[PDB]
């Protein structure tokens, strides 16, 4: 049992390519005008939690550089629908929430259903991110523009767009997008400078003191740090930016050429 050998094939590779061959040489296509995602928009789009208004306008401007009539109108509506003057209140018997207004949840759920049919992940992921006693509990569910019974689909949208962004080659943007998801071995320990014991954390337990002391400015380090695996003399990252820029020896009189024994 063995089929007959084949002499042609075609596969979709990368995120915007097409490879094929025929009965030989192999050609490579750049067919990126037939997919609903655009690579330039993924390089121009921004996300910034501290100021929603600016992001919507910047993305609306960026949508005009590509010539998509749809996105300009959508991002325009997003600005007015996500203003800070429409904040929900705490008591149900004080106002009707903007979510129940027919320009709230129902318009969002009509854009999302439109873009789903087009398979446009890139807009769904962005939209789902920008918008992110019994009576009191019911109110909290009622006052949200995204249904609390559909979190899984939104997480799936964000995850798939992140995988695409990894495929294209952009690393920072994937982290930016993934920062909005609702659902969230061997390590290194520090030998304390007072009790001479391994300490799990920037602060000790016996003497409760600082466990790590920088090997350039001798000031205790509490945030970022780099260290050598062989000799083990570490400090702030910018300090070794400056130090290992030219020299190749331990800054603490150790003799260990850390540049060669650490960068595996």
């Amino acid at each position: 049992n063995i089929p007959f050998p084949r002499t042609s094939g075609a596969r979709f590779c990368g995120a915007g390519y097409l490879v094929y061959f025929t009965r030989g040489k192999v050609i490579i296509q750049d067919i990126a005008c037939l997919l609903p995602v655009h690579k330039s928009l993924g390089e121009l789009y921004i996300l910034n939690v501290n100021d929603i208004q600016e992001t919507c306008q910047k993305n609306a401007a960026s949508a005009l550089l590509v010539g998509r009539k749809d996105l300009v109108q959508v991002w325009s509506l997003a600005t007015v629908a996500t203003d800070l003057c429409l904040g929900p209140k705490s008591d149900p018997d004080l106002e009707t929430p903007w979510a129940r207004h027919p320009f709230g949840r129902q318009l969002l759920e009509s854009l999302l259903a439109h873009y789903c049919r087009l398979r446009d992940v890139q807009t769904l992921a962005m939209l789902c991110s920008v918008f992110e006693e019994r009576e009191r509990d019911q109110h909290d569910k009622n006052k949200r523009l995204l249904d609390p019974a559909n979190t899984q689909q939104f997480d799936d949208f964000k995850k798939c767009y992140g995988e695409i962004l990894y495929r294209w080659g952009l690393r920072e943007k994937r982290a930016e997008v993934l920062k909005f998801v609702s659902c969230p071995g061997i390590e290194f320990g520090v030998y304390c400078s007072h009790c001479r014991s391994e300490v799990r954390g920037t602060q000790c337990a016996i003497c409760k003191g600082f466990t790590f002391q920088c090997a350039i400015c001798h000031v205790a380090v509490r945030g970022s740090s780099n260290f050598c695996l062989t000799c083990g003399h570490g400090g702030h990252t910018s300090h070794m930016m400056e130090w290992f820029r030219t020299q190749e020896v331990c800054p603490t009189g150790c003799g260990c050429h850390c540049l060669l024994e650490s960068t595996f």
């Binding site: 009539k69 109108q73 325009s76 509506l77 007015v80």
Partner: peptide
């Protein structure tokens, strides 16, 4: 206005 005049 956004809906009815581009």
């Amino acid at each position: 206005r956004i809906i009815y005049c581009s």
